[PDB]
Amino acid sequence: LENPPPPETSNPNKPKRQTNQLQYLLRVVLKTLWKHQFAWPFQQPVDAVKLNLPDYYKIIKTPMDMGTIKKRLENNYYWNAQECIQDFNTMFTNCYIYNKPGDDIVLMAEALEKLFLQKINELPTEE
Numbered sequence: 001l002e003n004p005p006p007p008e009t010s011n012p013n014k015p016k017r018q019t020n021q022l023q024y025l026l027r028v029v030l031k032t033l034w035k036h037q038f039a040w041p042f043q044q045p046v047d048a049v050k051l052n053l054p055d056y057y058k059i060i061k062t063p064m065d066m067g068t069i070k071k072r073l074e075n076n077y078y079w080n081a082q083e084c085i086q087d088f089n090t091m092f093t094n095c096y097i098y099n100k101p102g103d104d105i106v107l108m109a110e111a112l113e114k115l116f117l118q119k120i121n122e123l124p125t126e127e
C-alpha cells in the first residue's frame with residue numbers, strides 16, 4: 001500500500017483572515033507542543049510505508065498531524081479557531097483508535113493533549 005498524499009494545507013479558493021485566536025494557536029499552542037520532547041512522532045504524517053504499518057490507513061481515514069496543522073495556520077487555511085482545534089483533537093483521537101491504551105505512543109499523545117487543553121483554556125478574546 002502507498003501512503004496517502006498529506007492533507008491539503010493551502011487553498012486559494014478559501015477566504016483568508018488573521019485573528020487573535022488563530023495567531024495564538026500558531027504562536028502559543030502549536031509552538032508549545034512542537035518544542036515538547038514527545039512532539040516528534042506527531043510533527044509529520046504517519047509514514048506507514050517507512051514504518052511498515054500497512055494497516056494504518058486501512059482504519060485511519062481522517063489523518064492529521066502537527067506539521068499539517070502548522071502549514072494550515074501559516075497558509076491561512078482556517079477561518080475559525082475551532083477548525084484548528086478540531087484538527088488537534090483528530091490527531092489525538094486517531095492515536096487513541098489505532099494504538100492500545102497505555103502504549104508508549106498513546107502516553108506521548110496524552111502528555112501533549114494535557115498541555116494542549118491547558119493552552120486552549122487561555123484562548124484570547126475574539127474580535
Ligand SMILES: CCS(=O)(=O)Nc1cc(-c2cc(NC3CNC3)c(=O)n(C)c2)cc2c1ccn2C(C)(c1ccccn1)c1ccccn1
Binds near residue numbers: 041
Ligand atoms: C514523524 C512521523 S513518522 O511516521 O515519520 N515517524 C514515526 C511515527 C510514529 C508513530 C507511530 C504510531 N503508531 C505505531 C507505534 N506502534 C504503532 C502513531 O500512531 N503515530 C502517531 C506515530 C512512530 C515512530 C516514528 C519513527 C519511529 N517511531 C517509533 C520508534 C515509535 C515512536 C514512538 C513510539 C513508538 N514507536 C516506531 C518504530 C517502528 C514502528 C513504529 N514506530
